[PDB]
Design a protein around this ligand. Structure first.
Ligand SMILES: COc1ccc2c3c1O[C@H]1C(=O)CC[C@@]4(O)[C@@H](C2)N(C)CC[C@]314
Lengths: 201, 209
């Protein structure tokens, strides 16, 4: 069995996007597709279930009106329409399937798609402001979208350096790095590459 | 709906036996909840471990076993291996819908415990010239990779303007995280002291300006 999901998606708040999950292998049986949501700062969240052969569905109350599950037997494909998008809809969405000729009391989450990443934002491309920190550091504040790249003294300073993941502050991304003296920040989306050195106070 | 509760994190050593639990907010976990377990390894590698409380899925090692223990469902790993370091999600069926637990991060120990090394940076001059002030709390070299962060202003607990990253692995297989407290320039000048406190393995490491 294989589950092929639709490509990554970027949307503005209030918009709507449609995800798809095509099943392959042993689709002559009627099988369930379970949709799952995982935000970067959260675990798994069950959205709902759909049988593509019989059309039946089970839903999570929280997602009724937010997600709509549909399917078509012959193409062995399930769809999930996401309406009225918000920042809390930014997540990776997985489709899953049970085992072939498995029991109802066997594990339901046997086969997994590769996931569809949905990002909801109103933010325009923004270059990062870069600030010195004084071990010393480098604060990369207020860019969009990801990624940025950071090195120390053109990459000649690597040992003793900690570069932390990005976080979302005020709808833009903020990042930081530290060292046990200059940092080199690159934000390709803004076609930017800034350098800043730590003069002591 | 109902709420399903798991341990946030658990620790085991190679060869030990560890039990993960999965509780229901509605009452005892019944066989009619048909408890499932899912293992998440890095890079979104998911494996369905358990169905129907205790039916281990084809291909899953025998050291994994599900069961009911008291009023809750449980997953027992008898003879834990290194590859069993993962996040374990349980899920319960309530007649017409499914609910995931919050997940349990299972660390299989491979190095001694290490307390967080903490550094706290003030806002730069150049940031204050935008009338903004960001306080950067860097947290490094802690193991296991599970921490709580709390900030203070002049001793009082802060409740707004905090962003913290998920703990991420270092090259030495220890962990690192960062926390940011975002203020206005005036608000930072109002107060005498600011502090970042990291909680790890039942102990707090704190730094103050
Ligand atoms: C005791 O049987 C069952 C208990 C729980 C569930 C199911 C059961 O049988 C199936 C059924 O009737 C419709 C609902 C559902 O599709 C669903 C949840 N998925 C995930 C698995 C298969 C099935």
């Amino acid at each position: 069995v294989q589950l092929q999901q639709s490509g990554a998606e970027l949307a503005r708040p209030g918009a709507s996007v449609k995800l798809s999950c095509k099943a392959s292998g042993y689709t002559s049986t009627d099988y369930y597709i379970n949709w799952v949501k995982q935000r970067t700062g959260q675990g798994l969240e069950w959205i709902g279930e759909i049988y593509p052969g019989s059309g039946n569905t089970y839903y999570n109350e929280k997602f009724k009106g937010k997600a709509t599950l549909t399917a078509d037997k012959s193409s062995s494909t399930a769809y999930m329409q996401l309406s009225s998008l918000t920042s809390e809809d930014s997540a990776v969405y997985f489709c899953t399937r049970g085992g072939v000729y498995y029991g109802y009391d066997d594990a339901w989450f046997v086969y997994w798609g590769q996931g569809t990443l949905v990002t909801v934002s109103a933010a325009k491309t923004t270059a990062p402001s870069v600030y010195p920190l004084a071990t010393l550091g480098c604060l990369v504040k207020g860019y969009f979208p990801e990624p940025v790249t950071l090195t120390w003294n053109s990459g000649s300073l690597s040992s003793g350096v900690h570069t932390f993941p990005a976080v979302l502050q005020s709808d833009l991304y903020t990042l930081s790095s530290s060292v046990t003296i200059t940092c080199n920040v690159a934000h390709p989306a803004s076609s930017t590459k800034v350098d800043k050195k730590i003069e002591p106070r | 709906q109902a709420v399903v509760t798991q341990e946030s994190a658990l620790t085991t050593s190679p060869g030990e036996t560890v039990t993960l639990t999965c509780r229901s907010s509605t009452g005892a976990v019944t066989s009619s909840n048909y408890a499932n377990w899912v293992q998440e390894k890095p890079d979104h590698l998911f494996t369905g471990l358990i169905g129907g409380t205790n039916n281990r899925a084809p291909g899953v090692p025998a050291r994994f076993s599900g069961s009911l223990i008291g009023d809750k469902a449980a997953l027992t790993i008898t003879g834990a291996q290194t590859e069993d370091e993962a996040i374990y999600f349980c899920a319960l069926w309530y007649s017409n819908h499914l609910v995931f637990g919050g997940g349990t991060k299972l660390t299989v120990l491979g190095q001694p415990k290490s307390s967080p090394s903490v550094t706290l940076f003030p806002p730069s001059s150049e940031e204050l010239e935008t009338n903004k002030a960001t306080l950067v709390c860097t947290i490094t070299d802690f193991y296991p990779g599970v921490v709580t962060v709390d900030w203070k202003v002049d001793g009082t607990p802060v409740t707004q303007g905090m962003e913290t990253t998920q703990p991420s692995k270092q090259s030495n297989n220890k962990y690192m995280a960062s926390s940011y407290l975002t203020l206005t320039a005036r608000a930072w000048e109002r107060h005498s002291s600011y502090s970042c406190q990291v909680t790890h393995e039942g102990h707090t490491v704190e730094k103050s300006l």
